[PDB]
Design a binder for this molecule. Structure first.
Ligand SMILES: Cc1cc2nc3c(=O)[nH]c(=O)nc-3n(C[C@H](O)[C@H](O)[C@H](O)COP(=O)(O)OP(=O)(O)OC[C@H]3O[C@@H](n4cnc5c(N)ncnc54)[C@H](O)[C@@H]3O)c2cc1C
Length: 295
């Protein structure tokens, strides 16, 4: 009943770029684009929390065709315009060091996507993923722990929960639980969707809490840069409390290696009550209340 693999790599959907807009403001690090695609003509359906594949043009440094890369869907099932006709992605351009054969490497698919023009056709596969789905229970608590482009799934949840047009379109889901986004980025110009996140937090002060960890502007208690694990350690007790509720779901998304500082913070909070976190967490995973997607 969750749509999966409506389109596959041997016969992808050919969508058209509608728009490609920058999300990183002046003064920020790197390039992150919000890219919307037109889905009319195909039967690509998807829900919140899933990914799609993009097949980039070209051959690797071997003569072999490029393989797909997966991207978290950044729009709800209805699209940004709530018309059931489009799909959006949140794509950071990958590039890294000079001292690295050839010197200065650009990711193939992320560079392709971040510089793609309106009107261009793209090969799209999917949707894929059953690990990051939102419960259809409007009384759920939803903890969201994101870094960088890991905001993408979180945006689909929050938009479904709190956008007026979404609430009008989803009569069956009128969110009245509590949700808390902890969001780690390097700078304030790097806070993707900042204006819309803060608009939500102002309309729904009792239903949404927003916490940033901005490493180039904030210091942790040890004098280091503020990262998301520092913010989690700061609120570990109240995060642990919320996690004990049977209705609480926790989502973690972003670049790999964020999961370990989060566990250490929740281990110390759980230990105060004679619980072993790593054992409790295994149970949460089995129950489908612990959702992780890192890359
Ligand atoms: C489920 C899932 C969801 C994802 N969602 C998103 C999303 O929403 N937004 C997004 O931007 N990305 C997302 N990603 C990553 C996206 O999969 C592509 O991997 C990423 O965009 C880079 O692809 P590329 O094609 O640009 O690069 P490539 O050209 O394939 O480069 C990747 C390779 O270069 C190397 N490399 C990367 N970084 C470094 C470094 N610092 N130092 C040295 N070598 C390095 C590695 O060998 C890696 O295999 C997601 C991945 C998965 C698995």
């Amino acid at each position: 009943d969750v749509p999966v693999n409506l389109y596959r790599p041997n016969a992808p959907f050919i969508g058209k770029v509608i728009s490609n807009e920058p999300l990183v403001k002046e003064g920020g690090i790197g390039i992150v684009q919000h890219i919307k695609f037109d889905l009319t003509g195909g039967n690509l359906k998807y829900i919140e929390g899933q990914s799609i594949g993009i097949i980039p043009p070209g051959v690797d440094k071997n003569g072999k065709p490029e393989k797909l890369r997966l991207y978290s869907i950044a729009s709800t099932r209805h699209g940004d315009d709530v018309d059931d006709k489009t799909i959006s992605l949140c794509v950071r351009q990958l590039e890294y060091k000079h001292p690295e054969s050839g010197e200065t490497v650009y990711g193939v698919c992320s560079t392709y996507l971040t510089h793609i023009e309106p009107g261009s056709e793209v090969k799209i596969t999917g949707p894929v993923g059953k690990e990051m789905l939102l419960p259809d229970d409007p009384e759920a608590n939803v903890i969201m722990l994101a870094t960088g482009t890991g905001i993408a799934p979180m945006r689909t949840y929050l938009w479904r929960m709190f956008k007026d047009a979404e609430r009008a379109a989803n009569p069956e889901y009128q969110f009245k639980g509590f949700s808390w986004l902890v969001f780690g980025v390097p700078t304030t110009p790097n806070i993707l969707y900042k204006e819309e996140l803060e608009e939500i937090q102002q309309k729904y002060p009792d239903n949404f809490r927003l916490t940033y960890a901005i490493s180039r502007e904030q210091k942790n208690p040890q004098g280091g840069r503020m990262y998301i694990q520092d913010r989690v350690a700061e609120h570990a007790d109240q995060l642990w409390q919320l996690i004990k509720n049977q209705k609480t779901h926790t989502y973690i998304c972003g670049l790999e290696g964020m999961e370990e500082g989060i566990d250490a913070a929740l281990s110390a909070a759980a230990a105060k009550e004679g619980v072993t976190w790593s054992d409790y967490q295994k149970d949460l995973k089995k129950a489908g209340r612990w959702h992780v997607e890192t890359y």
